[PDB]
Structures are given as structure tokens and as C-alpha cells.
């Protein structure tokens, strides 16, 4: 699960080394930055249903064709799977804010996504519309502090770029 800790430990292990100063110094960065990301994670945890509804709504408002026969949102059960998928990504963003790295997105959300969405004929731009809507809907300092926004937005761009 990529994070500050796991990156430095993996690198030391690959070299047969004990932890040393740059490893400990890297981890001091955790101690400084954790407040901003854990603020974003808590805001997310506390309000994900409303966030996910707005994001899924924006997807379908942008792409009404999705609701046509044979398209990815042709019926209610498929529509609900779409909002569920937005909820999964938001939960993984919460996980990345907690871990302080992209590990939970990389492992549980991005790896194999291309193959899945292509095979199941789910258009990537619809996912990107959801995540981008959320990134641009973010309101600082209304919703959270500036640095909590930066952390939150970084993971949303990371996912967008991963899908693009």
C-alpha cells in the first residue's frame, strides 16, 4: 500500500539496509502533513452520501445518452451501480487521505479499471465527469481548510489522470 512509510521501508529492504536518517526524516513529513489530509478524510467520511449524489447527478446531466437502450445507464439497477462506483472511488480517496499516499486508489480502484470499463462498455469520460465535478465543486474555506482542499484535490486529479 504505497505511503511515506512503505516507500522508505521497501527501498531499505531492497538494499538490505536498516532504517537510517533519511528514512526517519521522510516520516517526519507524516507528522507535519497528516492534519491537513485527516481533515479532508473526516469531511469526506461525514458527508459522502451528499457528495456522491451530486457527482452522479452531474454525470447523467452531462451525458443524458447514458439512459438510452443498450447504454451503461439504461435502467435503474445500472444507474445505481454508477452511483455506487462513485461512492467506491470517494471511499478510496478517503483511504488515500488516511494513508498519505495513492496505494488504496492504485490497488483497489485503478489497477484493472481500464480493462473492466472497456469490456463492460462503461465510458471513462462519465467517470471523469463525476470526479472532475467533485474537484470543481470543492469550496474553500466553506468545506474545509485550504491545505485539506489541496490534499483532497490532488487525489481527485490523480484519479482523473489515471483514467486519462
Amino acid at each position: 500500500m504505497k505511503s511515506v512509510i512503505t516507500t522508505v521501508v521497501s527501498a531499505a529492504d531492497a538494499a538490505g539496509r536498516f532504517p537510517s536518517n533519511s528514512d526517519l526524516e521522510s516520516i517526519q513529513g507524516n507528522i507535519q502533513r497528516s492534519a491537513a489530509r485527516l481533515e479532508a478524510a473526516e469531511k469526506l467520511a461525514g458527508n459522502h452520501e451528499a457528495v456522491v449524489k451530486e457527482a452522479g447527478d452531474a454525470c447523467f446531466a452531462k451525458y443524458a445518452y447514458l439512459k438510452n437502450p443498450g447504454e451503461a445507464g439504461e435502467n435503474q439497477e445500472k444507474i445505481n451501480k454508477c452511483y455506487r462506483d462513485v461512492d467506491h472511488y470517494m471511499r478510496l480517496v478517503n483511504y488515500c487521505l488516511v494513508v498519505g499516499g495513492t496505494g488504496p486508489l492504485d490497488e483497489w480502484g485503478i489497477a484493472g479499471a481500464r480493462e473492466v470499463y472497456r469490456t463492460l462498455n462503461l465510458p471513462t469520460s462519465a467517470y471523469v465527469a463525476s470526479i472532475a465535478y467533485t474537484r470543481d465543486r470543492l469550496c474553500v474555506p466553506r468545506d474545509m481548510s485550504a491545505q485539506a482542499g489541496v490534499e483532497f484535490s490532488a487525489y481527485l486529479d490523480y484519479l482523473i489522470n489515471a483514467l486519462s
Binding site: 500500500m1 505511503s3 512509510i5 512503505t6 521501508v9 521497501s10 531499505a12 529492504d13 538490505g16 539496509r17 536498516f18 532504517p19 537510517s20 528514512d23 526517519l24 516520516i27 517526519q28 507524516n30 507528522i31 497528516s34 485527516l38 478524510a41 473526516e42 469526506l44 467520511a45 461525514g46 459522502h48 471511499r91 478517503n94 483511504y95 488516511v98 494513508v99 498519505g100 496505494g103 488504496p104 483497489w108
Partner: protein, 177 residues
């Protein structure tokens, strides 16, 4: 590998749950006490050569048959392997302490080790005694109560870190028994 944070994430994910305030107080403390954790890891790595040397010598002086012919430490090649294993084990326990999670130790060091020692004829009981001695040394260093050396720290309570590293050392015996 997981660390303390990704451990919580794994547990939450099993329930499809977000990590929110209630679950976050423990990780908030983990962070608030983070300098102590860095100091504890520093006190081990800074004395790692002496630890391994003293622990493996201690195993032998308690069980001197280990260096008789047919003993598993007999010959330089065997003594060098054993010392190497002592340091490897310490290195992985030191990763577990820095990460606040045993998974790097279990996954990369402990898995396969009993079978291997069984296959080679490395005595798992003497192995456990070397590991118990490093445990004793590690707790001493983390609490700055080593008899032969002191290091420099702002005064405070590191009981939990000492307990935690002891649990990692205790994992090695469990895996190899």
C-alpha cells in the same frame, strides 16, 4: 506491506466503511507520538551490530554444543550465516516498529522460515533464545535503560513502544516453533 494507517484502511474496507473521526483518534495519537517512534527506531539501528553480536554470542555461551563439531554454529561459514540471520531478523523487526505494523516482518521474513530452518537443520530453539536476547536489548535501548550505553532523549514514557517491539520479537518464535 501495510503500515499502521493502511492497517486501519484494510479493516474498514472489509466493511465497505469510510474511516472517520471515531477510528481516527488512534492514528491521531500515532502521529502525536511519532517523534518517540523515530527515536525508538534510532536507538535500535544505532546499536544493531552490538545487539546481533552479543545475542548470538549469548545463545552460544548458554549452549556451547552449538560450536562443537556437528553443532549448527560450527565452522566460520555457519557462524557467519547465523550472525547474518540475527541481523536480518533485527532489520525486519526494526521495519515493523517504524511502520507500526507486523506485516513486513510476517510477509517478507517469517513466511517460509520454519520450513527453511527445518530443511537446513537450523535449531529453532536456539534461534528463539538469540531472538529473546535481542528483545531484552531492544526494550533496554528504547527505554534508555541499557547498562553499558545511554543515548539522548527528551524525558517521557516509551512503555508502549517497548511493548510493541517486544510483540514483534515474539512473533519470530511463534512463527518458527
Amino acid at each position: 506491506m501495510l503500515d499502521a494507517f493502511s492497517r486501519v484502511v484494510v479493516n474498514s474496507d472489509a466493511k465497505a466503511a469510510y474511516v472517520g473521526g471515531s477510528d481516527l483518534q488512534a492514528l491521531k495519537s500515532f502521529i502525536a507520538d511519532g517523534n518517540k517512534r523515530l527515536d525508538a527506531v534510532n536507538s535500535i539501528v544505532s546499536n544493531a551490530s552490538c545487539m546481533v553480536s552479543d545475542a548470538v554470542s549469548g545463545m552460544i555461551c548458554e549452549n556451547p554444543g552449538l560450536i562443537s563439531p556437528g553443532g549448527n554454529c560450527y565452522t566460520n561459514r555457519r557462524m557467519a550465516a547465523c550472525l547474518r540471520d540475527g541481523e536480518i531478523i533485527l532489520r525486519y523487526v526494526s521495519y515493523a516498529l517504524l511502520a507500526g505494523d507486523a506485516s513486513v516482518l510476517e510477509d517478507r521474513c517469517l513466511n517460509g522460515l520454519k520450513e527453511t530452518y527445518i530443511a537446513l537443520g537450523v535449531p529453532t530453539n536456539s534461534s528463539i533464545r538469540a531472538v529473546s536476547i535481542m528483545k531484552a536489548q531492544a526494550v533496554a535501548f528504547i527505554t534508555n535503560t541499557a547498562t553499558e550505553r545511554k543515548m539522548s532523549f527528551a524525558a517521557g514514557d516509551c512503555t508502549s513502544l517497548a511493548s510493541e517491539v517486544a510483540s514483534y520479537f515474539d512473533r519470530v518464535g511463534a512463527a518458527i516453533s
